Amino acid sequence: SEATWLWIGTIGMVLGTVYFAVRGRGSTDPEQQTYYIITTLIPAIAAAAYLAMATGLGVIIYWARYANWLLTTPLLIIDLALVAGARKQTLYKLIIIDAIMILGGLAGSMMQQGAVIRIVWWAVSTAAFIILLYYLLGELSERARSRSAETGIVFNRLRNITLGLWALYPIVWILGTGGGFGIIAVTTEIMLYVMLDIGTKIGFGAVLLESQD
Numbered sequence: 001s002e003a004t005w006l007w008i009g010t011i012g013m014v015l016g017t018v019y020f021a022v023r024g025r026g027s028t029d030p031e032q033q034t035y036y037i038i039t040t041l042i043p044a045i046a047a048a049a050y051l052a053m054a055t056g057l058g059v060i061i062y063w064a065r066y067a068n069w070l071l072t073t074p075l076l077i078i079d080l081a082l083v084a085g086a087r088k089q090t091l092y093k094l095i096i097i098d099a100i101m102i103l104g105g106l107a108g109s110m111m112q113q114g115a116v117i118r119i120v121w122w123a124v125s126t127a128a129f130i131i132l133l134y135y136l137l138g139e140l141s142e143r144a145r146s147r148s149a150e151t152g153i154v155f156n157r158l159r160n161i162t163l164g165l166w167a168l169y170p171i172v173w174i175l176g177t178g179g180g181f182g183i184i185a186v187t188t189e190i191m192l193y194v195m196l197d198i199g200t201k202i203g204f205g206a207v208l209l210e211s212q213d
């Protein structure tokens with residue numbers, strides 16, 4: 001099930017990338033084309049990472065996983081901020097916090113001395129997640145609603161998908177082998193990550209690009 005699910009994820013991300021690329025080839029408006037560039041760059045990086053995983057590279061430590069996360073999550077955050085009309089400084093705060101969360105996940109997964117400081121890293125990354133959640137529910141949502149009612153609705157949709165899917169990643173991590181106590185197998189963890197990435201990238205981007213009229 002290892003290579004099976006890696007290739008499932010590779011094909012899913014490649015299909016999402018080519019669909020987002022061919023869906024935006026007819027557009028000259030700067031805002032829409034920026035949205036399309038970022039929204040197609042996310043699953044393209046995801047597909048590159050999954051191809052590296054399934055080709056025997058990507059694992060030494062699942063470095064390609066954290067590469068995919070560290071590269072795509074800030075682009076998802078940039079899309080969220082563009083939709084919300086957020087201040088540049090708030091966007092910088094969100095990017096720093098998200099990078100800290102993902103790097104803390106990578107650390108806690110990479111440590112070996114026991115389950116103590118690994119779970120401490122898990123708690124630090126989860127606190128980064130909580131403050132990210134508070135920023136998305138507070139400042140970004142308020143800004144999106146102050147833009148317009150339609151903008152508030154679209155950002156509500158996108159924010160709900162984002163938070164609901166992101167909150168599952170630390171669960172898979174603390175239950176998974178690569179990060180926590182190995183309660184679920186490596187293949188089950190890879191399947192769950194594949195499905196979560198399919199959601200958080202393809203479906204989120206489909207909503208965001210459909211919502212441009």
Ligand SMILES: *C/C=C(C)/C=C/C=C(C)/C=C/C1=C(C)CCCC1(C)C
Binds near residue numbers: 122129167169
């Ligand atoms: C396309 C990939 C995405 C959207 C990945 C998102 C991943 C996360 C939000 C992961 C978060 C983590 C924590 C909140 C704590 C435990 C460590 C992580 C890295 C699994």
